[PDB]
Design a protein around this ligand. Structure first.
Ligand SMILES: *[C@@H]1O[C@H](CO)[C@@H](O[C@@H]2O[C@H](CO)[C@@H](O[C@@H]3O[C@H](CO)[C@@H](O)[C@H](O)[C@@H]3O)[C@H](O)[C@H]2NC(C)=O)[C@H](O)[C@H]1NC(C)=O
Ligand SMILES: *[C@@H]1O[C@H](CO)[C@@H](O[C@@H]2O[C@H](CO)[C@@H](O)[C@H](O)[C@H]2NC(C)=O)[C@H](O)[C@H]1NC(C)=O
Ligand SMILES: *[C@@H]1O[C@H](CO)[C@@H](O)[C@H](O)[C@H]1NC(C)=O
Ligand SMILES: *[C@@H]1O[C@H](CO)[C@@H](O)[C@H](O)[C@H]1NC(C)=O
Ligand SMILES: *[C@@H]1O[C@H](CO)[C@@H](O)[C@H](O)[C@H]1NC(C)=O
Ligand SMILES: *[C@@H]1O[C@H](CO)[C@@H](O)[C@H](O)[C@H]1NC(C)=O
Ligand SMILES: *[C@@H]1O[C@H](CO)[C@@H](O)[C@H](O)[C@H]1NC(C)=O
Lengths: 109, 174, 48, 81, 174, 174
């Protein structure tokens, strides 16, 4: 049962400055050679959508500004640049074994 | 059984021997039972386990078939690829079967020697003291305790002391 | 499901070094030999 | 009193083969051959394969109107057609 | 001869033995001659015949060369086909020669054990009654009939009765 | 050691024996030393040398890789050529390793029989005259010269004469 702790709880960056979001896991979410942690974004009043799958690969249709890197227990997501159309709540999900667990969320101010 | 230890001299196995592979049966005044010697069965376990790994280790590198496709106008190449892929499989399946067939004979013959040599050293230790019956049985003369059976079991059989009582027993039956 | 080796007829869960399912396999898994039976003897021949 | 030599024996009926005679019974036999499969077709190392149902490589790459579910396909392990 | 039965103890074959492979020569008061025991030569016949079939049975699946032709503008493929076809033949002709070479050694060594074990059981039955000369000959003490020779031949040698007359013959020569 | 001659009966080698492979150690009134018998070590030399050549002779015909090139538009053929060339090397490197692995076992086991059979004939010649200690040592009774040791060495041991003095020595210790 991996529990996800995500810090900072609320992130505040103006337009154009790198925004780093991170979350850590209890044990390693890396198995079979690839780390299984997916990054989700939920805009206000909207259903969440997939941003990064397997912590490295980026979904088609997601702008290349979203970068995710990580290995082992710590993973980070960076956005370059940041505009007004980026405020949302971001979650990191593990899928090493059931049940799946989500992060505590992070408002991007 | 080339060495003849299995069947031959001893044609009957011991179902009561579950502790190990090779052992000794003692029938003396202090009861009877089955006991094992570790130095013989441990080497057989190590030798067989090494053989089992060796089959797996040697077979690590083998032909791996891969898919190739052709456009119905090049059938000589497709036939060449088809005959090459199954030809390699035929070669490799013969090596695996031949290796298994030969190593099965090795293990059975290897077990023959270990029990045969186990018998040889007991005869070589007891010598004149005991008589050879024919089914692997030794009937010694001295009226010693069960520790002497263990002495036979640790391969430490001192001869001289036991010779005098036994030679007094070679002259009373003669 | 999730299997370390996959074949056109299914998938393999094992650590044995041989199989006779299909040659066109993908992933690190036992090699293919066209044999019905392959056993290694690790014991004495028993009279009973 | 008597002392003799002997070997392990078992009531098992495991059959092993050898060149001299095809049928010999041994106390312990190890089998190395897999003849059973789950019968399914799932992913390898956690990445789902690209399962082409009815259209093929030519149809999918060209974008056949029958199969529009294979556009913008993510990473795959292998292609099944 | 690893087991040493061929040559070694018995370095001279019997040309008069045509009935079977392994047998016993008796030289007693009731004439002399050669006789055979079926239980030893039958197993050798079955074992060798099984081996002969096994070479044929295992070699059933082999590479079969087929003819392919090319149009003088594709010589890399023709060279590839030529090197593949004769390469497989070179692999398969090595397996056949190696298999024949090894199985020839098996048959000679397998025959060594059978005659060696045949000698071992006769020594194990006669034991003190006879003396070991060196060329496989046993010279027993009791003055029994030719049926006792057959008793040695069916492997049913009862010891006790013959021991008393023989031990009376171990004390008159001593 | 299936035959058990190496270790088993004789677990200690002779560093002072450099003349040959198999020999006899004599410890009598006329000094002591090591001596060799040529008929045993010469056959081992010839047998092993024939085996060493046989590995080289049999391996004369082998796959020989040759270079072929393709024009970046025919990769199925290039993959076919690449998988064929290294596939043949994988097949041939397995035959060479398996042949070396098996023939190493043959030489060690072949040497076991030669020294074992060398022991067997000496026991078969001395018989009642000497006693078997356990480590290959024979302690005979007659007080003959060093020539009798050579007589054991040329395999010409006449029994009768030495029996009378030895049987006078079997009755004084009994
Ligand atoms: C097939 O793949 C599985 C992984 O999915 C391998 O792990 C084995 O999975 C089985 C099924 O859960 C385990 O059996 C269980 O064992 C526990 C005791 O540890 C017992 O309490 C359960 O009731 C159940 O029987 C098994 O232990 C586990 N490991 C091994 C070594 O078998 C499995 O090995 C693969 N192969 C096979 C033939 O299943
Ligand atoms: C040796 O073992 C094989 C393998 O089991 C035996 O072959 C089986 O024989 C039975 C009896 O007729 C058949 O029902 C099976 O279908 C056979 N199986 C196979 C794989 O052939 C064989 O009978 C045994 N004995 C001998 C002498 O070969
Ligand atoms: C994301 O950033 C990492 C390091 O922070 C870098 O190694 C990687 O190349 C970047 N990925 C992309 C797609 O730019
Ligand atoms: C077992 O054999 C070893 C051999 O050195 C000896 O030390 C030991 O005393 C033996 N066991 C008994 C109970 O005598
Ligand atoms: C082996 O199985 C048979 C089956 O009837 C049984 O009679 C016998 O007692 C068993 N032997 C052992 C040692 O369990
Ligand atoms: C041959 O041996 C068998 C073994 O049971 C015995 O029944 C038979 O009597 C023997 N032959 C003769 C002539 O005694
Ligand atoms: C060595 O043995 C041969 C065997 O024929 C014999 O001729 C010779 O005399 C022996 N050597 C000696 C010194 O007796």
């Amino acid at each position: 049962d991996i529990v996800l702790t995500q810090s900072p709880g609320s992130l505040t960056v103006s337009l154009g400055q790198r925004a780093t979001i991170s979350c850590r896991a209890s044990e390693s979410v890396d198995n079979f050679g690839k780390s299984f942690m997916h990054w989700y974004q939920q805009k206000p009043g909207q259903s969440p959508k997939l941003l990064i799958y397997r912590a490295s690969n980026r979904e088609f249709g997601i702008p290349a500004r979203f970068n995710g890197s990580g290995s082992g227990t710590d993973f980070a997501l960076t956005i370059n640049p940041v505009e007004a159309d980026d405020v949302a709540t971001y979650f990191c999900q593990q899928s090493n074994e059931d049940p799946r667990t989500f992060g505590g969320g992070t408002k991007l101010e | 059984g080339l060495f003849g230890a299995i069947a031959g001299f001893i044609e009957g196995g011991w179902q009561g021997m579950v502790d190990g592979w090779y052992g000794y049966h003692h029938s003396n005044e202090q009861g009877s039972g089955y006991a094992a010697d570790k130095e013989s069965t441990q080497k057989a376990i190590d030798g067989v386990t090494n053989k089992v790994n060796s089959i797996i280790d040697k077979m690590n590198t083998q032909f791996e078939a891969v898919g190739r496709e052709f456009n119905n106008l090049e059938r000589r190449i497709e036939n060449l690829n088809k005959k090459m892929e199954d030809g390699f499989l035929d070669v490799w399946t013969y090596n695996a079967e031949l290796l298994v067939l030969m190593e099965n004979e090795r293990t059975l013959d290897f077990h023959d020697s270990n029990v045969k040599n186990l018998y040889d050293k007991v005869r070589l230790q007891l010598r004149d003291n005991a008589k050879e019956l024919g089914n692997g049985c030794f009937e010694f003369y001295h009226k010693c305790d069960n520790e002497c059976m263990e002495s036979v079991r640790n391969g430490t059989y001192d001869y001289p002391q036991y010779s005098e009582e036994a030679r007094l027993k070679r002259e009373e039956i003669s | 499901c999730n299997t370390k080796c996959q074949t056109p007829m299914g998938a393999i869960n094992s650590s044995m070094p041989f199989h006779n399912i299909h040659p066109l396999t993908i992933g690190e898994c036992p090699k293919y030999v066209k044999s019905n039976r392959l056993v290694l003897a690790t014991g004495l021949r028993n009279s009973p | 009193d008597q002392i003799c030599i002997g070997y392990h024996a078992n009531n098992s009926t495991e059959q092993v083969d050898t060149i001299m005679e095809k049928n010999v019974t041994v106390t312990h036999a190890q089998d190395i051959l897999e003849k059973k499969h789950n019968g399914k077709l799932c992913d390898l190392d956690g990445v789902k394969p690209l399962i082409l149902r009815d259209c093929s490589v030519a149809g999918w790459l060209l974008g056949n109107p029958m199969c529009d579910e294979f556009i913008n396909v993510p990473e795959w392990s292998y292609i099944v057609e």
